[PDB]
Every structure is written in structure tokens, then in C-alpha cells.
Amino acid sequence: MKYMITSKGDEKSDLLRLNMIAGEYDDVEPEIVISIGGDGTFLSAFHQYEERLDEIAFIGIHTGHLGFYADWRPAEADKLVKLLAKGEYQKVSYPLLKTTVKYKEATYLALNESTVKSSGGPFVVDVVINDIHFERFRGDGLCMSTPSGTTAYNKSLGGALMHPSIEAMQLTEMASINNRVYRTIGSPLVFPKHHVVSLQPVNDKDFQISVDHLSILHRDVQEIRYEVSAKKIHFARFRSFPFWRRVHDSFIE
Amino acid sequence: MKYMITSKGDEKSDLLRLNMIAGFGYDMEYDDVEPEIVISIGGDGTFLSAFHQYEERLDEIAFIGIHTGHLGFYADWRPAEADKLVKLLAKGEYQKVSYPLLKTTVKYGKKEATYLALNESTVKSSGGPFVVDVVINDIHFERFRGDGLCMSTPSGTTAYNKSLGGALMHPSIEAMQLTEMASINNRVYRTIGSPLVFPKHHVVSLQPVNDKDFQISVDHLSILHRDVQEIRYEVSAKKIHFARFRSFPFWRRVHDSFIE
Amino acid sequence: MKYMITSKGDEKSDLLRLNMIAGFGEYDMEYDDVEPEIVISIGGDGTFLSAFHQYEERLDEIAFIGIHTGHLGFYADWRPAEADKLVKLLAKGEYQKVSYPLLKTTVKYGIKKEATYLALNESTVKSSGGPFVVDVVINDIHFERFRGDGLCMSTPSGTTAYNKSLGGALMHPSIEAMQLTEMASINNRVYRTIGSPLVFPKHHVVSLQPVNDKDFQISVDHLSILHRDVQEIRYEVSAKKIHFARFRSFPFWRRVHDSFIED
Amino acid sequence: MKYMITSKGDEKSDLLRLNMIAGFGEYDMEYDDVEPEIVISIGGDGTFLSAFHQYEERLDEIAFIGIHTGHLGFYADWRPAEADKLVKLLAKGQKVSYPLLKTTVKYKEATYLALNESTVKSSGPFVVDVVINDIHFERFRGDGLCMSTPSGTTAYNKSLGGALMHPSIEAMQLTEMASINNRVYRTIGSPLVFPKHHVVSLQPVNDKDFQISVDHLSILHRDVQEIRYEVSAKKIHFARFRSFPFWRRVHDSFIEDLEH
Ligand SMILES: Nc1ncnc2c1nc(SCC(=O)NCCc1cccc(Br)c1)n2[C@@H]1O[C@H](CO)[C@@H](O)[C@H]1O
């Protein structure tokens, strides 16, 4: 079982990694990626292997608080190393979000969400759903979230928490003015498979596109397209940790 | 084939109804016992009544909605197109689109009651405070206190669910959404706040705390349930069937309702 | 000083009530439930609301005092163990009065005559069956046409109650105003509403006018009664204020802190 | 008396500006762009915001007038076509005052006067402690906090879910910005309205580098120890000629404007 282990950068994350590397290691051709740190560290491990997501099972270990991705306690590593080498383990697939920027295309993959902000002034775009105009937005920005990313930025924006077994994407508003000229729906929008949300600029055409907090200052933007990606992220399932339990322990104590 | 038409009650619906019935005088016969096509004329509430009127044979009935007033999400056919609809289904040249439904189970302390919802199923209190425990898949999630709770169908998300601050879902997604009704997050009764979208095979159980009397409403059919032990929510295996002739996208229909 | 005490009805409240009465007996304190100058509410916020409505004609000659036998309330903020020190401060008259604004609700019919109600928390208006459809007229000028469950006008002190659960803003009771909050507005193109909570100052009148149905379920501090053939429902900050006998200094924001955050 | 006119930038705001300056020359009206008694803004609310900060040291002897070249503004409520009447009414000689927000930053004590709001973001994660009148209230974590003026409730505050407050009420409102409310960081959620003499002290937790924006004048402050909020004694004055109610401007902005 060719595997590969990432680390945050602290002493503990670099130490426990050595405690697991003792019990083949391939960083170019991995089948088992073990993230050590938190959810942010897990995101970096995801972006490191986007091209080969269809051949990789991910495992998250938190050296800090309980994360929706990094859930395994550091003490579980001694039992985690033996079960992964056993060869017998079932995978769990979560949907992903595809983000295309038009000018020559520019595709992106997101595990949490992909937000579109402004590069200084107001954010004014036209929301086009399946080649049909829906609304003209004005405010801070917009947020298209993955089912697993709903518990992140999406929830803080007033989004709905949906179970990752649902193949869809959720669009939420970011401080919409919502007046006569720029009447927005207000409510979060959940789009299924093969549904495309096309963001079209009115002016400016310079937006701050952020994919999992990786915010790039895109210039000369003519179109931004969102859709449920065909590629799915696989998790190595050993124990039983229900999604709603993880949500309960996070926000409801 | 066999068909029937329900009416809202106003002159506009009953007159338009008789005008369409005479149009089937094709190989169409009127029958309100075992129909193959059911036409609703009036509003969404009129359509909901036609749903429960024939919720015993949903798998053999195609519904068609006609709105005499403003645009509805079920009744989306304008009375000006009533002429074309008669000939269209007369030849049987149309497709079939299915939307998910919601199953509501009420257990007492006895038997049990099962209900089907096209819009949503809401549970409020019989006057005083509404205090229950939210159980998801035999696992506790929160203790709710406030007015009530709302479990919505994907197609019903644009109804009461939206006004309660819920999220809109496309009716091709087989799921259900739970939204709060004036919850009081005062450290004693911590709730999630955010709407919760549950997939298939997931069971959301509402278990009472002190009071055991609840006002359970299924698509605005509220009847008092005394001595309730459990209220279970899950996506029904039964599906409503529409007879879409043209192409009226769900999101486009949302745009014409709220955005315009 | 004429006084009286209301009780929640449980063992603890009734017991504490009797001992407090005997405590006042040691001083110049006369018991009177007809014309009291001091009204003590032993129980909760719900018990406090009953005591308020019990004497809503003598609000000026009365300084209310709340005692909570259970969890902390925004009105009943005195612990039962402090009932002994409460008497000794009341008997001497060693206290100052703090006033909170109130909400006036005026109901007009097809004139049988008229009806006015005072609210300490809020006043809600809903339908008696179908949809709730009214025109919101702010100062003789039409603002919006509403459709949904209803509308809730809250007092500053009542913002921590039903108002907060409906997404309303929390106001400090020193501010003389009122807050209108929506109750499940459909908010479409036909019935476009503001969505946001509205805070109206004094001398501002919010008029609710029927569109079709004239039967409305009006609830003042959860005293819900059915009003038929309603012509108009007016909202405005009353000139009457509830008075509290202040001894210590319990911050309103701390009461919010202890109730919704941690304590 | 002395007057001046500020312009947006486009030809529309400049052409209308010159037209007014000419008309006032026919009346006894001195022209000073340094020490005026009357300041006229042409363009929009953003143009008015600039006209406020440009002369925020002489708010005592200045009555502002707003003219919207585009859509209706809450500070620019006069129409371009009504400019001819405006020149006449200002030449012949009521005044309305709105509350202002005082933003104090301690690292040197910097003072800021906001007409709309004063937001505080981070630089990544924004984490501060909220202190109200020398006592702890909550520990915030999210995008940031927004303290708004009564007249500024219709701006960023409304978009953040804040309540609309009439300018007659001398107060300030605090709203959350994408707050993550969980076990560790439990916030109130609801917007908070503060009366006069009430001080909201924002004190850092982790990093001392916060982005402070007073009326879109985003300035990165370094080594901040405390950010105070209070209802400023300074009040912006307006010139009244025609009754244009605050709730009307709210209606004509967010609801509908049938006569336009
Ligand atoms: N989302 C907002 N909605 C309705 N008012 C806002 C918003 N945002 C700010 S300023 C905060 C900000 O920089 N947001 C980034 C995008 C943006 C910028 C300026 C205007 C707009 Br719109 C959007 N405002 C108001 O803009 C005024 C300055 O022109 C300030 O008073 C903000 O209140």
C-alpha cells in the first residue's frame, strides 16, 4: 500500500508523523494520504493531489480541535497504521465543486467552497442559471459551497447544512443590498448535478476569486461558472463517526 | 383516457373548468374514481387538495396545475394555454416528471399514523411553549424550544420553508429540509440555527419532553395529536408525478415568483 | 408603604412570599393588593407579566420588583436568598426608580367601538385561519403589503423575548422606541416586504390595514384574543412607562450575557 | 451666505454643478470651498460621505444638501430637475441633525467620525473580545464586527441583516459579519442597539493587526490594544425645505418606486 503523509509544521505534527512512518512511501504515486494538523492542513493535502483524486483515499488527523476532515485523535495513529496496511477498508466519497474562469478557461477544484469577492469597489454581477438570467447581485460577494463545506464558511453566511451524501452545491449571498435595482433571492440556493451557475460581470471585471481560502486576484474576467464536479474525494472509513454527530459536537456541545 | 378536474371555488376556476371539460368531448372520459390525469385549477393550495384527494393512487396519476390568479410553483399553466393543454394530453404526447415526497410517522402510547406531504410537515405546540428533543438516526442532536419545526419537501422549499429563512432546493434532489420556527437559543436550549438538509434513508425523530400534545400540520391540514410518543421524519419512497408538456425550469419559475 | 406580592403558585414561591410578608411586618409596611405602591413578583418573567397587567391602571404609583425562584429572567433579576436584604432596603425607602417604555396597541372596528392595550414585551397580530394579509401604513403613508404568518411589534425590554427569536435586534431599555419584526413573510413580487426589523421612535404610528380578511388574532404579551371586523391596528410608543425599584445595578447587557451566552 | 458644491466626477455631476454656481451668483451668496456655511453634494451617497469627511471639522456651522445624479440615495434625496428650485430656496434662507459614531483606536489615541458605519476586520481569522461598559460580553470570531449609525442602518447594516433604525433615535447598532457561532466562540447572533454613553470596547485576542474601515476609508491599524465605540456628541446638520420622511426613502429604495 503506497502511502504519503503531510504535516502542518509544528513539533508535534512532525513528531507523530515519524511515529507513523516507522510502522512503501510514495509522494508522487500515493494511494493513502494521511493529513496531520487540522482542516486547513487537510485542504492543502487535497490541493496537492487534485489530478489523481480518483486513486487516493484520505485520512485526517487533528493535533488540535475536532475537525470535520481531521477527526482522528493522535492516539489512534497506533491503530490507524495497522488497519491501513491490512488492505481491507471501505471508502467514502464526497462531492466536489468545479470553478471555471473565462476570459481560454481556468478550472479549479474545491473541497469547502469557492467565493467571488470584489477587488476594491462594489461587487456587481449577473447570476445566470443554466443560460437563463436569475438575478443581478450587488454587495460583498457570493459563495458556492460543497456539501461537506457547508459547515465552514457557508454556515456563517446563513447557509443550510446538508449531508455530504447529497450530490449538490449551495450558493449563499454575502451582504446583498437587495433593493429595487438589484433584487436578490435572499435564500440560499442548492443546485444538483449538471446545473451550472454562471456569474457574469456588469463592470470592473476584476474579482477576488478564492478557492478554499486560496484567493487569487483574477483580472479581465468575462464569466465565472460553477457546477458539481464529476471527481469525488475518498475517505478511508474504519470507525463510525456520523456527520450529524460531528456537527452536534461542533456547534451544540 | 380517464380524467377529472378540481376547482378552487371562485367563478374564474369553475367557468374555466367547464370550458375545458367540454374540450374533451376526444377519447377522454370523466372519472373521479380511477383517473389517469388530474387537473387542478386555482392555486397551489388547490393543487395540494387534489394531491391528498388522490394520494392512494399516486403512481398512476399525472397532475396538471392551472393558476387563475398569480403564478404558482405547481399551478404554472396560464388559463390562456388551456386550449392547447386539452389537445396536447388528448394525443398523449407528453413526458413525466417526478418530485420527492415526505413521510410523517406519529407514534403514541395505540397504532401509528402515516402522512404524505407535497409541501411540508410542521409541528407546533397546542398553545404554550414547544419543547422537544431532535433525534437524528437514533442519535440526539439538540433540545428545541420555540414555536415549532418545519420539515420541507424539495418542491415545498419555495413555500413556508423559504419564509422561515430556509434554503431553496431543486426538486430533482431527493431529500428533506428542517427549519426552525422562532427558536430561543438561550444556552439552555442550544439549537443549530442553520437549516438542515437530510438525504434519503435518514430519520429525523422528534421526541417530546414535558408536554405530549402537538399541532401536527401536513400541507396546512393541522389536527391536534394528543399523547404523542414520537414524530419521525424521512424521505418517502412514493413520488408525485407531473405531466410537463413544455419546458418550465424550476429556477426560472422561482425568478418569476420572487425576483420580478 | 402599601405593597403586595404575586406568586408563581409552586411551593418555593408561596413559601418565600409568606416569609417576606412577615418580614415587612417588622416595619411600616401595609399589605394591599388594591392600591399598592410596591409590587413584588415571585416566580418568573411570565409571572411578572401577569403582575404588570394586574395593575396596568396604576403603573405610575407602582414600582415593580421581580424575584426569580428558578432561572434568571430579564424582569425577575433578584435571587430568593436576597429577599431578606430586599425588605430592609424597601422598608427604609432606600432605592431609586428606573423606567422602561411601553407599547400601545389600538384596535378599530366597523363602527363595536375601540380597544387599547398596553404591552410590556410585545404585541403580535396574526390571521384567524388562512393567510395574514395587511397593508403596513407608516405615518399615513403606505410602506408595504404583507403576506405570511403575522407581525410582531416589540418593546425595548421585550426585544430579548419573542422579538429575538424572530431575528429582531436587541435594544437597551433606556431607548424609548419600538421594533417591528416580520413573522414568515412570503416576500415575493406581489407582497414585497422590507425583511429587516424596523425601529420606530416616539410619536411614530404604524397602521396595519386589512386587505381581505378582517378577522385577526391579536396577542398582547401572550394574551391572544380574536378580534373580528377589524378596520385598523395602530402601533405607537405609549406615554406610560413601567417603573422598577432599583437597589443595586444589574446591567441589561449582562442579563443578555447570562441568558444567551453563559452564566 | 457662504456655500460650496462637491461633485462626483462624471460629466453629469459637473454640468449640474456649474448650473447651480451660476444661479447663486444672481443672489447674495458668497462662494468659499474652505470655510462654507452650506455644502452641496452632487452624485450619490458615496459623494456625500466624502463631503462629510472633507469638512468634518466644521460640522457645527454647515448644513449639508444631497443631490443624486443616479438612483435615489438616503443622503442625496433631491432630484436633478429640482435644482432650479433648490437655488431659490437656499438663497432666501429648517435644520435636521443626525447622530454620529465616534470610533476611538488605542495602540496616539486616534479619533474617527463615521456617518454610516465603522467595521473592523482582520488582516486571516478575526478574533476579538466584545466589552460593553467595562465588562465582558462575548468573544467574536468571523469576518468582523460592524458598528453603525442610525442613518447608516440603511447601508452596510441592512445587508448584514441589521435592523433599520430611524435617525431620530440617538443610538448605534452592532452587527455580526459571517460569525462562526460554536462551542468555543458563542456570540449573541442578534444585532445590538446601544444608547448614548454606552461604550463598546473591542479588544484583540491573537493578532494586533486589524483592518479598520470608517465609511469605506479602509485603513490598516497596527499594534492595536483597544477599539472603542460611542455615540459622538458631534451631529451632522441637514437643510430642510420639503418633507421627505426617512421611511419614505427606505420604501422608495428597497420596496418600490412606482412613479419612477
Ligand atoms: N455590501 C454592502 N452593501 C450595502 N452597502 C455596503 C456594502 N458594503 C459597503 S462598504 C464595505 C465594502 O467595502 N464592501 C465591499 C463591496 C462593496 C463596497 C462598497 C459598496 C458596496 Br454595495 C459593496 N457598503 C457601504 O458602502 C458605503 C461606502 O460607499 C459604506 O457606508 C458601506 O456602508
Ligand SMILES: Nc1ncnc2c1nc(SCC(=O)NCCc1cccc(Br)c1)n2[C@@H]1O[C@H](CO)[C@@H](O)[C@H]1O
Ligand atoms: N468566517 C468564517 N466562518 C467559518 N469559516 C470561514 C470563515 N471565513 C472563512 S475564510 C474567508 C475569510 O477570509 N474570512 C475572513 C476572516 C476569517 C478568515 C478565515 C477563517 C475565519 Br473563521 C475567518 N472560512 C472558511 O475557512 C476555510 C478554510 O480556509 C475557508 O475555506 C472558508 O471556508
Ligand SMILES: Nc1ncnc2c1nc(SCC(=O)NCCc1cccc(Br)c1)n2[C@@H]1O[C@H](CO)[C@@H](O)[C@H]1O
Ligand atoms: N418562540 C418564542 N421564543 C422566545 N419567547 C417567546 C416565544 N414565543 C413567545 S409567545 C408566542 C407564542 O405563542 N409562542 C408559541 C410557543 C411559545 C409560547 C410561549 C413561549 C415560548 Br419560548 C414559545 N415568547 C414569549 O412568551 C412570553 C409569554 O410569557 C411572551 O412575552 C413572548 O415574548
Ligand SMILES: Nc1ncnc2c1nc(SCC(=O)NCCc1cccc(Br)c1)n2[C@@H]1O[C@H](CO)[C@@H](O)[C@H]1O
Ligand atoms: N407564511 C407562509 N409563507 C409561504 N407559505 C406558507 C406560509 N405559511 C404557510 S402554511 C402555514 C400557516 O398556517 N401559515 C399561517 C398563515 C398562512 C397560511 C397560509 C398561507 C400563508 Br402565505 C400564510 N405556507 C404554505 O402554504 C401552504 C398552505 O396551503 C402550506 O403548505 C405552506 O407550505
